């Protein structure tokens, strides 16, 4: 529904360019899925820590 073949025979240049753009946009969305998941994980954990008591951010360093 997102990755579709192109009808090269009986196909205009403008449609070909739009199709290449759509394929690359779908690829960009697929590549954005892990970036968005990681950003959400990090920021949500940080926000939850911000909502934690004050002692959560004062633990001794394990090194």
């Amino acid at each position: 529904m997102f990755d579709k073949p192109f009808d090269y025979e009986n196909g205009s240049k403008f449609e070909m360019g739009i199709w290449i753009g759509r394929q690359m946009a779908y690829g960009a969305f697929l590549g954005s899925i892990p970036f968005l998941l990681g950003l959400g994980l990090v920021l949500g954990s940080y926000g939850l820590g911000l909502m934690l008591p004050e002692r959560a951010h004062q633990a001794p360093s394990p090194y």
Partner: protein, 44 residues
């Protein structure tokens, strides 16, 4: 006629021409962004 994709030679040429036009447009946009950044904050 060596083809691993089911594409004819002329179809490949036209597709490559369209792809290269888009690539040049993308390069131009990237160059504009780099010039803006260089004016704002040079890294050299």
């Amino acid at each position: 006629d060596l083809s691993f994709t089911g594409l004819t030679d002329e179809q490949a040429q036209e597709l490559h021409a369209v792809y290269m036009s888009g690539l040049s447009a993308f390069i131009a946009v990237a160059v504009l962004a780099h010039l803006a950044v260089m004016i704002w904050r040079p890294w050299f």
